[PDB]
Design a protein around this motif. Structure first.
Motif, PDB file in Angstrom:
ATOM      1  N   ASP A  91       0.856  -1.224   0.024  1.00 17.36           N
ATOM      2  CA  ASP A  91      -0.304   0.087  -0.040  1.00 17.36           C
ATOM      3  C   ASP A  91       0.973   1.021  -0.009  1.00 17.36           C
ATOM      4  OD1 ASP A  91      -1.433   2.359   1.123  1.00 17.36           O
ATOM      5  OD2 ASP A  91      -2.554   1.127   2.531  1.00 17.36           O
ATOM      6  N   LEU A  99      -6.885   0.855  -2.107  1.00 17.53           N
ATOM      7  CA  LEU A  99      -6.109   0.790  -0.626  1.00 17.53           C
ATOM      8  C   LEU A  99      -4.767   0.945  -0.839  1.00 17.53           C
ATOM      9  CD1 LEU A  99      -8.108  -2.375   0.663  1.00 17.53           C
ATOM     10  CD2 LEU A  99      -8.694   0.193   1.045  1.00 17.53           C
ATOM     11  N   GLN A 106      -1.535  -8.487  -4.010  1.00 13.19           N
ATOM     12  CA  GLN A 106      -1.749  -9.558  -3.086  1.00 13.19           C
ATOM     13  C   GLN A 106      -0.962 -10.741  -3.681  1.00 13.19           C
ATOM     14  OE1 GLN A 106      -5.779 -10.560  -1.781  1.00 13.19           O
ATOM     15  NE2 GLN A 106      -6.097  -8.157  -1.890  1.00 13.19           N
ATOM     16  N   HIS A 128       3.588   0.479   3.079  1.00 11.23           N
ATOM     17  CA  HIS A 128       3.645  -0.801   3.793  1.00 11.23           C
ATOM     18  C   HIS A 128       2.794  -1.792   3.243  1.00 11.23           C
ATOM     19  CE1 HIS A 128      -0.275  -0.013   5.572  1.00 11.23           C
ATOM     20  NE2 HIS A 128      -0.118   1.541   5.460  1.00 11.23           N
ATOM     21  N   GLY A 133      -6.657  -8.311   7.374  1.00 12.31           N
ATOM     22  CA  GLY A 133      -6.660  -9.127   8.842  1.00 12.31           C
ATOM     23  C   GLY A 133      -5.525  -9.111   9.397  1.00 12.31           C
ATOM     24  N   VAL A 135      -2.880  -6.692   9.056  1.00  6.19           N
ATOM     25  CA  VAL A 135      -2.074  -5.314   9.061  1.00  6.19           C
ATOM     26  C   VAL A 135      -1.108  -4.803   9.612  1.00  6.19           C
ATOM     27  CG1 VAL A 135      -2.304  -2.887   8.284  1.00  6.19           C
ATOM     28  CG2 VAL A 135      -3.996  -4.444   7.274  1.00  6.19           C
ATOM     29  N   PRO A 136      -1.549  -4.765  11.152  1.00  4.64           N
ATOM     30  CA  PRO A 136      -0.486  -4.138  12.055  1.00  4.64           C
ATOM     31  C   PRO A 136       0.614  -5.073  12.214  1.00  4.64           C
ATOM     32  CG  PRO A 136      -2.823  -4.519  13.148  1.00  4.64           C
ATOM     33  CD  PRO A 136      -2.910  -4.750  11.610  1.00  4.64           C
ATOM     34  N   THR A 140       4.340  -3.731  11.980  1.00  2.00           N
ATOM     35  CA  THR A 140       5.133  -3.591  13.162  1.00  2.00           C
ATOM     36  C   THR A 140       6.039  -4.818  13.023  1.00  2.00           C
ATOM     37  OG1 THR A 140       3.552  -4.916  14.633  1.00  2.00           O
ATOM     38  CG2 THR A 140       3.518  -2.429  14.239  1.00  2.00           C
ATOM     39  N   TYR A 196       0.960 -15.786  16.326  1.00  2.00           N
ATOM     40  CA  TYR A 196       0.165 -14.473  15.941  1.00  2.00           C
ATOM     41  C   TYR A 196      -0.661 -14.001  17.099  1.00  2.00           C
ATOM     42  CZ  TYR A 196      -3.247 -11.550  13.510  1.00  2.00           C
ATOM     43  OH  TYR A 196      -3.946 -10.329  13.237  1.00  2.00           O
ATOM     44  N   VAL A 200      -0.707 -10.232  18.585  1.00  2.00           N
ATOM     45  CA  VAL A 200      -1.695  -9.582  18.948  1.00  2.00           C
ATOM     46  C   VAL A 200      -1.905  -8.904  20.113  1.00  2.00           C
ATOM     47  CG1 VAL A 200      -4.229  -9.202  18.714  1.00  2.00           C
ATOM     48  CG2 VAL A 200      -2.959 -10.298  16.819  1.00  2.00           C
ATOM     49  N   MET A 203       0.942  -6.435  20.874  1.00  2.00           N
ATOM     50  CA  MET A 203       0.272  -4.875  20.016  1.00  2.00           C
ATOM     51  C   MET A 203      -0.554  -4.286  20.838  1.00  2.00           C
ATOM     52  SD  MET A 203       0.563  -5.758  15.960  1.00  2.00           S
ATOM     53  CE  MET A 203      -0.647  -7.099  15.952  1.00  2.00           C
ATOM     54  N   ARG A 204      -1.798  -4.900  21.474  1.00  5.89           N
ATOM     55  CA  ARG A 204      -2.887  -4.418  21.921  1.00  5.89           C
ATOM     56  C   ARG A 204      -2.398  -3.689  23.302  1.00  5.89           C
ATOM     57  NH1 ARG A 204      -8.085  -6.070  20.586  1.00  5.89           N
ATOM     58  NH2 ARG A 204      -8.750  -6.022  22.702  1.00  5.89           N
TER      59      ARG A 204
ATOM     60  N   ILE B 250      -7.266   5.438   3.433  1.00 11.61           N
ATOM     61  CA  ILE B 250      -6.786   4.466   2.617  1.00 11.61           C
ATOM     62  C   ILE B 250      -7.122   4.220   1.249  1.00 11.61           C
ATOM     63  CG2 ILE B 250      -5.715   1.922   2.358  1.00 11.61           C
ATOM     64  CD1 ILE B 250      -6.392   1.690   5.669  1.00 11.61           C
ATOM     65  N   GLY B 251      -6.064   4.522   0.344  1.00 12.93           N
ATOM     66  CA  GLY B 251      -6.251   4.867  -0.871  1.00 12.93           C
ATOM     67  C   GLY B 251      -6.646   6.206  -1.498  1.00 12.93           C
ATOM     68  N   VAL B 293     -13.785   0.156  -2.447  1.00 15.66           N
ATOM     69  CA  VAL B 293     -13.900   0.370  -1.157  1.00 15.66           C
ATOM     70  C   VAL B 293     -12.657   1.074  -0.693  1.00 15.66           C
ATOM     71  CG1 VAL B 293     -13.867  -0.807   1.246  1.00 15.66           C
ATOM     72  CG2 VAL B 293     -15.142  -1.761  -0.599  1.00 15.66           C
ATOM     73  N   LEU B 301      -1.972   1.594  13.300  1.00 14.31           N
ATOM     74  CA  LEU B 301      -2.862   0.612  12.907  1.00 14.31           C
ATOM     75  C   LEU B 301      -3.365  -0.523  13.805  1.00 14.31           C
ATOM     76  CD1 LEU B 301      -0.793   0.268   9.488  1.00 14.31           C
ATOM     77  CD2 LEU B 301      -2.955   1.278   9.792  1.00 14.31           C
ATOM     78  N   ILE B 302      -2.798  -0.541  15.061  1.00 14.23           N
ATOM     79  CA  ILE B 302      -3.067  -1.437  16.054  1.00 14.23           C
ATOM     80  C   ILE B 302      -4.459  -0.675  16.761  1.00 14.23           C
ATOM     81  CG2 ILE B 302      -2.701  -2.164  18.189  1.00 14.23           C
ATOM     82  CD1 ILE B 302       0.431  -1.752  17.614  1.00 14.23           C
ATOM     83  N   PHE B 305      -7.189  -1.684  13.577  1.00 16.44           N
ATOM     84  CA  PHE B 305      -7.628  -3.020  13.241  1.00 16.44           C
ATOM     85  C   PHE B 305      -7.569  -3.730  14.441  1.00 16.44           C
ATOM     86  CE2 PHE B 305      -6.141  -1.218   9.084  1.00 16.44           C
ATOM     87  CZ  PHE B 305      -7.173  -1.336   8.269  1.00 16.44           C
ATOM     88  N   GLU B 306      -6.894  -3.451  15.407  1.00 13.81           N
ATOM     89  CA  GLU B 306      -7.176  -4.412  16.613  1.00 13.81           C
ATOM     90  C   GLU B 306      -8.266  -3.604  17.644  1.00 13.81           C
ATOM     91  OE1 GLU B 306      -5.996  -7.333  16.138  1.00 13.81           O
ATOM     92  OE2 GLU B 306      -4.927  -6.790  14.490  1.00 13.81           O
ATOM     93  N   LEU B 307      -8.048  -2.499  17.915  1.00 12.53           N
ATOM     94  CA  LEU B 307      -8.934  -1.826  18.760  1.00 12.53           C
ATOM     95  C   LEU B 307     -10.187  -1.190  18.511  1.00 12.53           C
ATOM     96  CD1 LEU B 307      -6.439  -0.387  21.224  1.00 12.53           C
ATOM     97  CD2 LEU B 307      -7.324  -2.649  21.273  1.00 12.53           C
ATOM     98  N   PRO B 330      -1.157 -10.755  -9.800  1.00 11.31           N
ATOM     99  CA  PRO B 330      -0.341 -11.712  -9.002  1.00 11.31           C
ATOM    100  C   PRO B 330      -0.393 -13.238  -9.585  1.00 11.31           C
ATOM    101  CG  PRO B 330      -1.369 -10.451  -7.613  1.00 11.31           C
ATOM    102  CD  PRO B 330      -1.985  -9.747  -8.829  1.00 11.31           C
TER     103      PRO B 330
END
Ligand SMILES: O=N[O-]
Ligand SMILES: O=N[O-]
Ligand SMILES: O=N[O-]
Ligand SMILES: O=N[O-]
Ligand SMILES: O=N[O-]
Ligand SMILES: O=N[O-]
Ligand SMILES: O=N[O-]
Ligand SMILES: O=N[O-]
Ligand SMILES: O=N[O-]
Ligand SMILES: O=N[O-]
Ligand SMILES: O=N[O-]
Ligand SMILES: O=N[O-]
Ligand SMILES: O=N[O-]
Ligand SMILES: O=N[O-]
Ligand SMILES: O=N[O-]
Ligand SMILES: O=N[O-]
Ligand SMILES: O=N[O-]
Ligand SMILES: O=N[O-]
Ligand SMILES: [Cu+2]
Ligand SMILES: [Cu+2]
Ligand SMILES: [Cu+2]
Ligand SMILES: [Cu+2]
Ligand SMILES: [Cu+2]
Ligand SMILES: [Cu+2]
Lengths: 332, 332, 332
Positions: A91, A99, A106, A128, A133, A135-136, A140, A196, A200, A203-204, B250-251, B293, B301-302, B305-307, B330
């Motif tokens: 991206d 995006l 991909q 980056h 699903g 991304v961070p 990171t 994984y 996560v 990261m959180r 994004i994008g 989209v 990004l945490i 996408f996580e929080l 690809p």
């Protein structure tokens, strides 16, 4: 018709160095061809020997700085060799649509792709990896870099006069989240899938374990210190793909700073420190006036001196006692 | 004499939508009448079903966006029904005096009040509840929104030329601090008084458990994605009453951004990402150039996408292969 | 020849007050002589009685505000009495070379030194101690202040017209990291060497235990509230040597704000809240329009109201019902 444009192939270099380019465009618009090969690899990130599984563009953290001019086309061949284990993409914050390219790039291990986009806005920008699903985790793990889109007539100051750098460096700042057990020691893992959930969890916390320049504590020091001479004009591009930073040159300034990196804006003058938001690249221009060692830091000084976000310049030349002198040296 | 001015009653709408208004003022200064009814309510904030006791203006997190012009008077009837349990008030960052109105608007359950203030400065501004001794608890329970004070002649670019949006959205970003036991699971509570000390403890970690747009993970996705068409000019107002954020499309870009929200300043151009400090509203203007989209995120990004700090745009129209194309899809 | 210049000795005052000076320079360039004496001392920082070992310039947290004009020389005699235990130095972000002076000013207990530097850039700037290997410990023990380098012709607005303050205050904001045991109570220590590892551990959490103005919770309240009158023009200089802050005047604004503190830039207008990056001083100018109590806060409201980053103004004068009024006071 893009097929009527010149093509030029760029050979990238490892950060903090930057591939050769011309500030003022010497040609009309071009298709600028880049190739990057994704490399998942072990990296030792601190003096203690902490080893992570890094996810890189072209073998480095950060990925290399790409340089084009406004209204060039960037054509990137992105290769994911079958010696990697994960799906990746790219991206570009410089790009428009899909995006930033991530929806179009991909690549499973064993695949490659070629993306083209028009660099319609001048500035420094993050790029980056951003797999849906995940991304961070990828970002990171080091999978980020930057691209500089120069105005065709080069950089300008707040009055519209030219600013010409003699040297350029790219400092990528990376926040890592190495998982910790309840006594505080790092955990390392046997496969990415086994790592994984605890990645996560780590990261959180929103608390990096390490914050480094050029991929490791001390990377921009010693034999790998940045260099300059008194009187040289230096541009330092600085990116942070995930978390705010506040660069500062200890003993110097940002004479002209695009803190959020976009060259159509006038730079901020005479900055001590500036805020580069997570997800941004910024750029600072400075003319050195004194020789000696400088530290270039994130001025959360805990982040700098305890977590790793510090590098050095070694500057040659003549000392100016008018600007600074010790009148009485330390003594009883 | 304020009694000689026109009065206009506004009927507010739920975020991310914005009540109808005119960018360029079609009348002279007015008393613009708003009513909000405070609602304490249970809200499910994530996919796991985590339920909190939210404190809202008008039933939503964030509260609705109010829109007036510079030098209008804002007259707010604030109602605290007896079905609520707590004292509340309101502080407008747009207002001058009395702690933004908070000192004049303290309403117990079963009470109401009417505040008037002159909107002397153009910009987007936070409003939030702020009861003495309980301020961050109310704010971080969702009791905040924003007000936009447009210049009477509408928005202008860095050169003084008009900027006219076709659509406007209000993204309120909320940091929640759901108390955790020592294994990490949320605690929920039997009364607000029983919750208060552990809310304070949770807040003092400075680590949100959730960071959401429009009150919940995924709120601005699916059937509730934001929408636009290629060529449409969109203003996205974004507020964060308590904690820094760094929005990013994004994008896309922020073509013109007032990161700290105040329209007398020239906007920043061509931003990838911008920093909206906690306690601020900002605004970004973008003209869509590609369909598909987009994700609109806090670019930690945490956090995104996580929080939870991520929403989507769904954009209709024609794809522009000059701006971006897959040259080689690809493949092995 | 610097020896041909006038010398003027400044006698510093305790924050938040500022030594007398003239906004527009009444003389040509001068050597401005300052003396500061380092004091390590116990300080109680909160209402609970938490006591730390502070490291101060001139006995205060923050250190005093120094004021000069652009192109003056700052000549600082820095004294480390033998009643202290640690090595200290000073780094001026206003200065050029030798790590801002830190490389030239290392003083053991029982030593002093005199540094001179030319104040070549106008703005407010941080100064702080920075002993090699111990930098964040000293800074986050309170060993930081600021210097204001005024343009010779005083401050100017975004249009180049004069801005003249009637009053000036210096708010230093300090993040402390008081070590906590695993139940959460503070630890205190028997020597600095015995404290050092747990100070580092505490700092590495990146979570301050306290964030205070003028060295303690509540320091700028009560008999020590800041004061002004309706119609007075006030400059508030605000520094944070280590961590971002987001100042906000509750019930007011920053009419003109140099968020990153450098006066060659036009100020931002009409700010509600602004971001001062860690390692920076900023300055906000406001003309009071209403009497009463104001709170001046870091608008992370947890940081303000739970951790200590809040002070008060008490403003005298006439209430303006046109700007704000209670139309209907709170009632059933
Ligand atoms: O060339 N227009 O993006
Ligand atoms: O190097 N030209 O200024
Ligand atoms: O890798 N430089 O120390
Ligand atoms: O705190 N910076 O994302
Ligand atoms: O002066 N830099 O820490
Ligand atoms: O992007 N403005 O530095
Ligand atoms: O109308 N003066 O605020
Ligand atoms: O919609 N007028 O530009
Ligand atoms: O509530 N929208 O998914
Ligand atoms: O970290 N933002 O308040
Ligand atoms: O490009 N946005 O993560
Ligand atoms: O408030 N200036 O975006
Ligand atoms: O006086 N030149 O820094
Ligand atoms: O105090 N002179 O504007
Ligand atoms: O020290 N003032 O409360
Ligand atoms: O989060 N501020 O350094
Ligand atoms: O309005 N200040 O929290
Ligand atoms: O430093 N510019 O406020
Ligand atoms: Cu990847
Ligand atoms: Cu991104
Ligand atoms: Cu409330
Ligand atoms: Cu507020
Ligand atoms: Cu010290
Ligand atoms: Cu410093």
């Amino acid at each position: 018709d893009i097929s009527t444009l010149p093509r030029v192939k760029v050979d990238l270099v490892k950060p903090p160095f930057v591939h050769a380019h011309d500030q003022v465009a010497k040609t009309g618009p071009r298709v600028v061809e880049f190739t990057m090969t994704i490399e998942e690899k072990k990296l030792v990130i601190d003096r203690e020997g902490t080893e992570i599984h890094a996810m890189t563009f072209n073998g480095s953290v950060p990925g290399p700085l790409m340089v084009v001019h406004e209204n060039d086309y960037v054509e990137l061949r992105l290769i994911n060799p079958d010696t990697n284990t994960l799906l990746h993409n790219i991206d570009f914050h410089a790009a428009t649509g899909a995006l930033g390219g991530g929806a179009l790039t991909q690549v499973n291990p064993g695949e490659e792709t070629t993306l083209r986009f028009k660099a319609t806005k001048p500035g420094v920008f993050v790029y980056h990896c951003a797999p849906e699903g995940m991304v961070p985790w990828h970002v990171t793990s080091g999978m980020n870099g930057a691209i500089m889109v120069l105005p065709r007539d080069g950089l300008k100051d707040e009055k519209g006069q030219p600013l010409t750098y003699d040297k350029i460096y790219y400092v990528g700042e990376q926040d890592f989240y190495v998982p910790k057990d309840e006594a505080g020691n790092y955990k390392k893992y046997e496969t990415p899938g086994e790592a994984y959930e605890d990645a996560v969890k780590a990261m959180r916390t929103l608390t990096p374990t390490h914050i480094v320049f050029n991929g490791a504590v001390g990377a921009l020091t010693g034999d790998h210190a940045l260099t300059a001479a008194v009187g040289e004009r230096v541009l330092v591009v600085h990116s942070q793909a995930n978390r705010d930073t506040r660069p500062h040159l200890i003993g110097g300034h940002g004479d002209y700073v695009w803190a959020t990196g976009k060259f159509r804006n006038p730079p901020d003058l005479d900055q001590e420190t500036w805020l580069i938001p997570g997800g941004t690249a910024g750029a600072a221009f400075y003319t050195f006036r004194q020789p000696g060692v400088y530290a270039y830091v994130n001025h959360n000084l805990i982040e700098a001196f305890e977590l790793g976000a510090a590098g050095h310049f070694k500057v040659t030349g003549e000392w100016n006692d008018d600007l600074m002198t010790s009148v009485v040296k330390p003594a009883s």
